[PDB]
């Protein structure tokens, strides 16, 4: 009934020293029924990364929409869109459907190509921006993620240390949620290299 918890799933994003990290589980379900273990929730447009939780049909629709928009942005601007700018585009795009919204919990992550500054941001379904320094959480195990992130997180973590923190934050949160899990992916993002790691987790 509740659109934001039919399909399930989670996204978490963190900042580190000269790096950001964004991660998601791989589950798509129809309530109790597990349907897919390969439903990735993180996308990227140039060097800007977008995680999206919530109703899966909207997750797909919005990804296609932001691909559409960032592609036209690039052609006209003659440059790739930045995280700060994209964040405002996501907000605009969501709020234009104020009284008929996409049931999603988006999460932006990236590094500004000019300033080198690590950036993350989150949104409610209606477009309100949450620009936190430390971390952003989203999905059906957001409470669990808030608890994991709050205790595990410390500032200025190196990329390889940050990987361990965000992974353990995601995994243990997903294990306390019926509608999350079935695999996980973690992106470690630096100014000019990005490493993608699939995590081994329990498959129930």
């Amino acid at each position: 009934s509740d659109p934001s918890s039919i399909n399930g799933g989670i996204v978490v994003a963190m900042t580190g020293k000269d790096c950001v990290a964004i991660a998601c589980d791989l589950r798509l379900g129809s309530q109790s029924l597990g349907v897919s273990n390969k439903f990735e929730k993180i996308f990227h447009y140039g060097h800007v990364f977008l995680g999206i939780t919530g109703l899966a049909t909207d997750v797909t629709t919005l990804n296609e929409m932001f691909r559409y928009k960032t592609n036209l942005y690039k052609l006209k601007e003659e440059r790739a869109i930045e995280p700060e700018t994209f964040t405002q585009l996501v907000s605009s795009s969501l709020y234009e459907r104020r009284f008929g919204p996409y049931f999603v919990g988006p999460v932006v992550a990236g590094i500004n190509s000019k300033s080198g500054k690590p950036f993350i941001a989150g949104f409610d379904l209606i477009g309100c921006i949450d620009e936190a320094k430390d971390f952003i959480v989203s999905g059906t195990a957001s409470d669990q993620l808030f608890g994991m992130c709050e205790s595990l997180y410390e500032p200025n973590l190196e990329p390889e240390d940050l990987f361990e923190t965000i992974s353990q934050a995601l995994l243990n949160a997903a294990d306390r949620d019926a509608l999350s899990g079935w695999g996980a992916v973690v992106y470690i993002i630096k100014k000019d290299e990005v490493v993608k790691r699939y995590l081994k987790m329990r498959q129930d």
């Binding site: 409470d143 669990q144 808030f146 608890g147 205790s151 243990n172 306390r176 081994k200 987790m201």
Partner: protein, 222 residues
């Protein structure tokens, strides 16, 4: 229409050690967006080296703790001052709760102490009496924030040994009372940051063979 139930917030946490047990709880009591009290004790010494907390609707919480304390007293009268073992206390509480199956005590009950072999014990109850011995249990408002952290840091879940890469799990080494208290405090500090109903003060009751000891710590008051 009259609603006989309410939510007084609060969050509790029980952890069973090797030869000890702790039962902690914040001291904040609330309704809606108002604070009733910054220090309203929630975890209680019930005698016979048992500690108890009934988190949720405080009127049912107080009613139950009162009735259990009473049950301990009458157990002594009826059975020649025999000590009420933690497992016996747990079964007794089930009957108290299930007694009101069709108008429940709206509380999540946790008790802690030592079993008859002297090892640490924590029992966890639902509102209608289904109970179970556990090693680790957070209850109340910020339970969802604390439990995943405990799965990770007490039971070493999803943690493996470096070099083996997912082949060898981290061994389940025993935690000291000092080590547990650290994890309790950090659990409540984190919960206070991210949950509005958690704060003001933390009160921990530590149970050993020597008896019941108390420790109090300040929490953020916003």
């Amino acid at each position: 229409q009259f609603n006989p139930y309410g939510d007084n917030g609060g969050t509790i946490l029980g952890i069973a050690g090797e030869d000890f047990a702790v039962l902690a709880g914040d001291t904040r009591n609330i309704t809606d967006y108002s604070i009733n009290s910054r220090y309203e004790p929630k975890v209680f010494d019930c005698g016979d080296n048992i500690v108890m907390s009934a988190n949720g609707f405080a009127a049912d919480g107080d009613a139950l703790v009162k009735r259990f304390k009473n049950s301990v007293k009458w157990y002594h009268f009826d059975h020649n001052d025999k000590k009420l073992s933690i497992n016996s206390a747990a079964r007794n509480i089930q009957h108290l709760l299930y007694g009101k199956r069709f108008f429940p005590y709206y509380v999540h009950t946790i008790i802690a102490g030592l079993d008859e072999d002297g090892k640490g014990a924590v029992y966890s109850f639902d509102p209608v009496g289904s109970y179970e011995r556990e090693q680790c249990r957070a209850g109340g408002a910020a339970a969802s924030l604390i439990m995943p952290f405990l799965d990770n840091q007490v039971n070493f879940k999803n943690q493996y040994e470096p070099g083996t890469n997912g082949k060898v799990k981290k061994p389940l080494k025993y935690l000291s009372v000092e080590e547990v208290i650290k994890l309790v405090r950090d659990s409540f500090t984190s919960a206070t940051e991210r949950h509005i109903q958690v704060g003001d003060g933390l009160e921990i009751l530590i149970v050993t063979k020597d008896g019941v000891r108390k420790e109090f710590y300040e929490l953020k008051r916003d």
